């Protein structure tokens, strides 16, 4: 058997993450001061007799600074009051901020709040074009709409064209904020990534900044970063000890990039165990992917798929030596999960992740069959197979394992493929398909998404990519609707699914595959979140 030649770039990080020794004197000093600053900030939130505009701005600033996870109760109480008082008598800036903050927190505020800013045709009044702070907040709001919000159909186009026009003459750091916003909206960004930018590039440079909030945000970011580096060091040692870098050299070595994905799903300290479990799964399923895509023969892949369905160490002998390596590591990993969840009495929930893993591998094997046979399915059949091979049903299920408050009922809801999950999966599928079309096309893949779409509808590549872009827009509207109260499960279990969709948008920005090619997209983010501290 002549296997194909290896083409993936090596890990660009070497061993720089493998050892991190926390300085306990500094961590304890930071924690002590943060406790003091946390209370000052709580009192700012609970202050009586604030005007609406000032209250919304305080909440928005605390959220962008990345410290709102300390004040979930206080912020919820305030927005719930604002929602029920239903105030509709403010300028564009305050109205658009009100709309976005309420919708992001699940309060279904009516979009009729914008009618006073439009003419008889439902088009925004052009006289608003000189109000830059109003336009910026309208721009950010336009990204949180559902299918019931067609009154906002024009908001993105209107605000974009006039912010573009105004930007070159704005003072700093407003100019940098507007420019950044036009490249990456707040609602679809990765929270730690957006926070790092706002703290260092914008708030640190505002003349009017609150010194208490800024010091709090810097110390908190840097203290959480120490924990993230300990976790990554622990995961790096785990990866090193497995040594797939030398025994399975055909596969991508990307454990740092996998950790960035897990950090995007949740960053808070209470999800430390969940992050470490999630990153080990992403790493391991990535090995399996490479095995199907660029090494194993048709016959070997059939054996691998059947052995996964049986999930039994007795099956290893049916497999080639190199496949024995990964099969045993997979079975071991889930045994580790069961043991790790044992003192909390939650060992039994591991089977949910295992069943989603079997589904991914079955569909990998179908994808391989289609390739060898030269089959181009209709779009409906393509999607019935290819949605699972995003791995996103599996990752969402895995993200719940280390969450102590997740119950059997939560897994039951997820297992039925609810709408919000189906939407996040669709976004991953169609964005990856648009980004990777030309590459896979040169490698002879006749069953690529854009290809199936062109043959099915009988349209051009350009038209097919546009149809896929519409599918993604429909899916974002479905995610936004899925966050609205009453929710079918706690909001705690919805945010990971939203954050999986945000990771798609950030990774394939400017239409390029960032995970296989971390140099352009992901490398700057990894440096800013895991190498460089914020200077105080």
Pick from 345, 339, 401, 270: nearest CA to 410 = 401
Write the DSSP symbol of residue 489.
Answer: S
Which residues partner with 118 through β-bridges?
124
Verify that 150 and 277 share a domain, yes or no: no
Header resolution in angstroms: 1.9
3-state secondary structure of 29: helix
Phi-psi region of 48 (alpha: psi -120 to 50; beta: other; left: phi over 0): beta
**Strands, E, within 364-424: which ranges?**
none
Q: How far is CA 377 from the centre of its chain?
A: 30
Last residue of a domain, one of 169, 184, 208: 208
Q: Which CATH number do you get for residue 299?
A: 1.10.600.10
CB 357 within 8 A of CB 308: yes
Nearest to 397 by CA among 287, 273, 276, 493: 493
Q: Phi and psi at residue 118, in whole multiples of 5°?
A: -125, 160
502 is in an annotated binding site: no
- 472-487 burial by CB neighbour count: b if 16+ within 10 A, else e? beebbbbbbbbbeeee
The number of angstroms, rounded, from the C-alpha of 529 to the middle of its chain's C-alpha atoms is 15
Residue 124's beta-bridge partner residues? 118
Q: Transcribe 225-243 into DSSP letters.
A: HHHHHHHHHHHHHHHHHHT
Contact 37, 170 (CB under 8 A): no
Residue with tokens 């055909």: 250
> Quick check: 518 and 254 in contact, CB under 8 A?
yes
Please indicate, yes or no, whether residues 215 and 194 belong to a single structural domain of this protein. Answer: no
The phi, psi pair for 124, rounded to 5°, reads -60, 140
Q: Identify the burial level of 403 via C-beta atoms within 10 angstroms of its C-beta, where 0-12 means exposed, 13-18 middle and 19 or more buried.
A: buried
Asked if 435 and 295 sit in the same domain, the reply is yes
CA 368 – CA 534 distance, rounded (Å): 46
In this structure, are 84 and 215 located in the same domain?
no
Q: Are residues 27 and 171 part of one domain?
A: no
Are 227 and 251 in a shared domain?
A: yes
- Residue where a domain terminates, one of 208, 237, 269: 208
Q: How far apart are the first and last CA of the chain?
A: 58
- Rounded alpha-carbon distances, angstroms, from residue 351 to 290, 407, 500: 24, 13, 22
Radius of gyration of the chain (CA): 24
Alpha-carbon distance 250 to 162, whole Å?
50
In contact, 444 and 434? CB cutoff 8 Å: no
Structure tokens at 480: 């936004």
The coordinates were experimentally obtained by: X-ray
Catalytic residues: 252, 261, 389-391, 429, 432, 508, 513, 515
440 is in an annotated binding site: yes
What distance in Å separates the CA atoms of residue 304 and residue 319, rounded to the nearest whole number? 7
Last residue of a domain, one of 155, 180, 208: 208
In terms of domains, do 40 and 120 share one? no
Structural domain that includes position 170:
49-208
Q: What are the DSSP calls for 433-464, one per residue?
A: HHHHHHHHHHTT-TT-HHHHHHHHHT--HHHH
| Cβ–Cβ < 8 Å for 410, 493 | yes
- Pick from 442, 438, 490: which is nearest to 462 by CA? 438
Q: Nearest 5 degrees, angle CA 115-CA 121-CA 127?
A: 70
Was 356 annotated as part of a binding site? no
Q: Determine if residue 432 is labeled as part of a ligand binding site.
A: yes
Q: Tell me whether residue 429 is annotated as binding.
A: yes
Q: Are residues 83 and 226 in the same domain?
A: no
**Alpha carbon 506 to chain centroid distance?**
8
Question: Which residues have C-beta within 8 Å of that of residue 207, sequence separation ≥ 6?
Answer: none
Give the residue among 433, 434, 376, 410 at the shortest CA–CA distance from 497. Answer: 410
**Helix 132-141 and helix 155-166, axial crossing angle in degrees, nearest 10:** 140
Determine the 3-state secondary structure of 121 from DSSP: coil
Q: DSSP letter string over 303-370?
A: HHHHHHHH--GGGGGGS-HHHHHHHHHHHHHHHHHHHHTTTTT-GGGHHHHHHHHHHHHHHHHHHHHH
My answer on whether 29 and 99 are in the same domain is no
- The position carrying tokens 């997820």 is 414
Q: Is 293 annotated as a binding residue?
A: yes
- CATH number assigned to the domain comprising residue 139: 1.50.10.130
Cis peptide bond upstream of 424, omega within 30:
no
Q: How many domains does the chain have?
A: 2
Q: Of 367, 368, 382, which is closest to residue 455 (Cα–Cα)?
A: 382
User: Do 336 and 273 contact (CB within 8 A), yes or no?
Assistant: no
Phi, psi of 395 (to 5 degrees): -70, -35
Do residues 78 and 13 share a domain? no
* Both tokens assigned to 485: 């109260």
Same domain membership, residue 274 and residue 156: no
Would you tell me the crossing angle of helices 461-482 and 449-457 to the nearest 10 degrees? 110
Which residues, in sequence order, are CB contacts of 290 under 8 Å at separation 6+? 8, 250, 251, 252
């Amino acid at each position: 058997i002549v296997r194909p030649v290896a083409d993936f770039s090596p890990s660009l990080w070497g061993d720089q993450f493998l050892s991190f020794s926390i300085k306990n004197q500094v961590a304890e000093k930071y924690a002590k001061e943060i406790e003091a600053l946390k209370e000052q900030t709580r009192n700012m939130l609970l202050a009586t007799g604030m005007k609406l505009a000032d209250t919304l701005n305080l909440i928005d600033t605390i959220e962008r600074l990345g410290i709102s996870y300390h004040f979930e109760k206080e912020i919820d109480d305030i927005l719930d009051q604002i929602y029920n008082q239903n105030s509709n008598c403010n300028d564009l800036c305050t109205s658009a901020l009100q709309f976005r903050l309420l919708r992001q927190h699940g309060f279904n505020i009516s979009p009729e709040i914008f009618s006073k800013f439009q003419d008889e045709n439902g088009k925004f009044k052009e006289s608003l074009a000189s109000d830059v702070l109003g336009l910026l907040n309208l721009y950010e709001a336009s990204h949180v709409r559902t299918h019931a919000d067609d009154i906002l159909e024009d908001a993105l186009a209107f605000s974009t064209i006039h912010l573009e026009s105004a930007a070159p003459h704005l003072k700093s750091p407003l100019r940098e904020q507007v420019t950044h916003a036009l490249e990456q909206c707040l609602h679809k960004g990765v929270p730690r990534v957006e926070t790092r930018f706002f703290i260092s590039s914008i708030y640190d440079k505002e003349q009017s900044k609150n010194n208490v909030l800024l010091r709090f945000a810097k110390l908190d970011f840097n203290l959480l970063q120490m924990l993230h580096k300990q976790e990554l060091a622990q995961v790096s040692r785990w990866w090193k000890d497995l040594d797939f870098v030398t025994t399975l050299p055909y596969a991508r070595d990307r454990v740092v990039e996998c950790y960035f994905w897990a950090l995007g799903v949740y960053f808070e300290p209470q999800y430390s165990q969940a992050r470490v479990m999630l990153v080990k799964t992403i790493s391991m399923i990535s090995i399996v992917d490479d095995t199907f895509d660029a090494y194993g023969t048709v016959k070997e892949l059939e054996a691998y798929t059947d052995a996964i369905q049986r999930w039994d160490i007795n099956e290893i002998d049916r497999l080639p030596d190199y496949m024995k390596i990964s099969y045993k590591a997979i079975l071991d990993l889930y045994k580790d999960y069961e043991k790790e969840l044992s003192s909390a009495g939650r060992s039994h929930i591991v089977c949910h992740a295992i069943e989603r893993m079997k589904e991914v591998v079955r569909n990998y094997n179908v994808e391989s069959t289609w390739f060898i046979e030269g089959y181009t399915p209709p779009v409906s059949e393509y999607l019935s197979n290819a949605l699972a091979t995003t791995t996103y049903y599996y990752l969402a299920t895995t993200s719940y394992l280390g969450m102590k408050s997740a119950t059997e009922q939560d897994f039951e809801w997820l297992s039925k493929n609810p709408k919000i999950l189906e939407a996040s999966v669709i976004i991953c599928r169609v964005i990856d398909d648009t980004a990777t079309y030309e590459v896979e096309k040169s490698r002879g893949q006749i069953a690529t998404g854009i290809e199936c779409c062109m043959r099915d509808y009988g349209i051009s590549t350009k038209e097919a990519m546009a149809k896929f872009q519409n599918m993604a827009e429909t899916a974002w509207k479905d995610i936004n609707e899925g966050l609205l109260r009453p929710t079918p499960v706690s909001t705690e279990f919805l945010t990971p699914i939203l954050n999986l969709a945000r990771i798609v948008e950030v990774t394939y920005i400017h239409n390029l595959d960032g995970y296989t090619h971390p140099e352009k997209v992901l490398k700057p983010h990894i440096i800013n979140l895991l190498v460089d501290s914020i200077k105080i």
